[PDB]
Amino acid sequence: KSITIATEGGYAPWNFSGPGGKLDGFEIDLANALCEKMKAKCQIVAQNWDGIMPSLTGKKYDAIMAAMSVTPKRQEVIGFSIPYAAGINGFAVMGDSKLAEMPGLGETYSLDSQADAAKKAIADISSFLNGTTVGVQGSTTASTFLDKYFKGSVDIKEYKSVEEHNLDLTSGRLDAVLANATVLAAAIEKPEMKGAKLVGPLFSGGEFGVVAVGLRKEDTALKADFDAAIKAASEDGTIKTLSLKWFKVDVTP
Amino acid sequence: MQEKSITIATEGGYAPWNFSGPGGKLDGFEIDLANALCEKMKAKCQIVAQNWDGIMPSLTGKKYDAIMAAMSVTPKRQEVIGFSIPYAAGINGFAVMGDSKLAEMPGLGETYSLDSQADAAKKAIADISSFLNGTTVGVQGSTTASTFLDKYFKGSVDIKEYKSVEEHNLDLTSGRLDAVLANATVLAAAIEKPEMKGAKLVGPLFSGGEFGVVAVGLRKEDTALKADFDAAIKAASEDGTIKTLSLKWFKVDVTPQ
Ligand SMILES: C[C@@H](N[C@@H](CCCNC(=N)N)C(=O)O)C(=O)O
Numbered sequence: 001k002s003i004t005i006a007t008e009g010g011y012a013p014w015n016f017s018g019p020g021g022k023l024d025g026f027e028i029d030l031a032n033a034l035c036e037k038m039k040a041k042c043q044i045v046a047q048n049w050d051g052i053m054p055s056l057t058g059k060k061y062d063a064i065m066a067a068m069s070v071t072p073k074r075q076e077v078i079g080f081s082i083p084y085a086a087g088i089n090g091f092a093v094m095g096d097s098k099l100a101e102m103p104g105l106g107e108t109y110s111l112d113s114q115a116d117a118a119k120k121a122i123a124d125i126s127s128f129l130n131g132t133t134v135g136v137q138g139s140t141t142a143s144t145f146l147d148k149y150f151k152g153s154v155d156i157k158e159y160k161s162v163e164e165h166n167l168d169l170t171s172g173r174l175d176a177v178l179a180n181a182t183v184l185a186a187a188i189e190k191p192e193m194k195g196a197k198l199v200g201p202l203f204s205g206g207e208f209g210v211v212a213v214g215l216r217k218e219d220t221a222l223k224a225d226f227d228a229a230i231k232a233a234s235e236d237g238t239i240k241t242l243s244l245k246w247f248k249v250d251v252t253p
Numbered sequence: 254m255q256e257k258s259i260t261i262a263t264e265g266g267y268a269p270w271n272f273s274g275p276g277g278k279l280d281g282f283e284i285d286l287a288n289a290l291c292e293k294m295k296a297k298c299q300i301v302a303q304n305w306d307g308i309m310p311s312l313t314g315k316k317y318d319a320i321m322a323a324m325s326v327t328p329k330r331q332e333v334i335g336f337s338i339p340y341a342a343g344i345n346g347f348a349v350m351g352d353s354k355l356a357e358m359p360g361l362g363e364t365y366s367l368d369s370q371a372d373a374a375k376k377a378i379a380d381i382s383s384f385l386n387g388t389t390v391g392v393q394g395s396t397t398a399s400t401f402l403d404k405y406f407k408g409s410v411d412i413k414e415y416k417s418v419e420e421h422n423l424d425l426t427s428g429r430l431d432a433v434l435a436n437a438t439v440l441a442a443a444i445e446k447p448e449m450k451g452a453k454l455v456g457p458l459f460s461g462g463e464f465g466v467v468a469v470g471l472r473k474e475d476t477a478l479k480a481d482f483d484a485a486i487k488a489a490s491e492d493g494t495i496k497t498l499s500l501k502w503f504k505v506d507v508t509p510q
Pocket residue numbers: 008009010011015049066067068069070086087088089137139140141142179180181207208209211
């Protein structure tokens with residue numbers, strides 16, 4: 001019994017690599033814990049974000065564990081296991097800038113249960129970010145969110161990876177970036193991002209949704225195995241433990 | 254009773270010498286070495302991050318006491334700062350995308366000392382320079398690599414200078430650059446990361462000359478701190494610590510002698 005799991009490796013603490021390229025993070029530890037429950041040999045591979053879904057359908061590997069949110073558009077092309085996590089997103093800017101004054105600092109809005117307050121916070125941020133350049137990783141729930149609420153207000157610059165937009169924020173090429181808050185909180189702690197800060201509000205639900213294992217639609221048995229393993233790992237505190245270990249928070253839905 | 258205290262600056266952008274964990278904790282050969290040297294010196298070790306561009310003005314400006322950021326001793330640097338006895342030596346090479354015609358550069362698997370094999374090194378340089386004609390080569394500005402490129406490849410290649418290794422590596426993978434030149438252990442570690450899939454170390458490896466030896470950067474007249482580091486490095490070289498840490502981090506011996 002063997003399962004090849006693809007991750008990106010550019011999204012710490014979910015998935016990243018050590019100095020010599022060894023894949024590590026919450027999803028690597030989770031993949032191994034799930035495969036132990038499934039009684040299967042676990043092979044974790046790296047695949048760039050852009051080609052992660054065509055390589056799954058192309059059978060280069062069997063599953064995706066790369067902090068992939070379940071979205072109706074993705075559900076048209078691939079299948080998903082039951083969720084193991086949920087995404088919370090926010091903006092980061094250079095802490096010195098006037099943009100650090102973004103309203104709603106640290107306030108959290110669920111796009112599902114607080115649609116009225118979230119759309120007001122979004123409207124305030126959009127007006128506040130008028131004429132700025134915002135970096136985002138292309139083909140993400142974050143680029144979808146920016147396209148939906150900030151398009152004619154902000155100049156949206158899309159990047160292949162988080163690392164790429166973060167370097168353009170620190171050089172001053174970008175005014176702000178939008179990404180998963182745990183990813184940004186980890187990134188701004190790195191020496192290269194000295195001076196960067198999380199600002200304004202945090203958003204969950206809606207576009208961001210929940211994170212699950214990406215699988216081919218026809219792999220019903222593999223989905224059934226992952227579903228039983230995630231249920232069992234949620235039930236014995238395994239996922240919560242790994243989340244606290246990596247994120248110092250609980251990302252479980 | 255209480256130990257003295259030293260603040261050591263590193264860059265954090267030069268794995269496996271110095272880099273950081275996902276949450277910014279500084280790690281690598283120089284972090285392990287800094288802590289081992291401070292234990293020998295019986296001093297409290299505080300390791301801080303400082304970008305390469307401002308690393309020397311912040312040392313002279315007394316933001317910290319020492320630099321352990323894989324800094325080579327050069328006559329130009331010796332005019333402005335002091336150095337401890339060396340703890341390592343730099344080996345440099347080019348990296349390109351393996352699919353580039355540039356990957357066939359003469360001659361992979363070879364090493365040339367610019368000090369002892371000057372004749373064979375200049376002959377190999379003359380071949381690489383002609384081979385790289387009209388290409389764009391990325392390099393970290395104010396390094397032994399930028400000095401080496403300025404000396405032998407200026408006028409043959411378009412040299413593009415970057416503030417960090419990570420920046421030129423991203424421009425190599427996007428195709429903005431044809432090649433990069435940097436420390437081979439740094440490039441060998443970098444090409445193993447998912448972002449640098451397809452990149453490869455090509456052509457020969459160079460040591461000595463411009464590259465020289467790595468030592469702790471200190472304020473020019475901070476003689477007590479230099480005396481402290483010199484005794485610790487001597488003791489650390491004597492018990493195999495530097496060789497051990499070198500093998501642990503690079504899987505090659507970087508010690509000079
Ligand atoms: C958990 C995260 N999901 C996003 C971004 C994931 C990008 N993953 C990666 N670069 N590895 C998505 O699936 O589009 C979020 O919404 O907060």
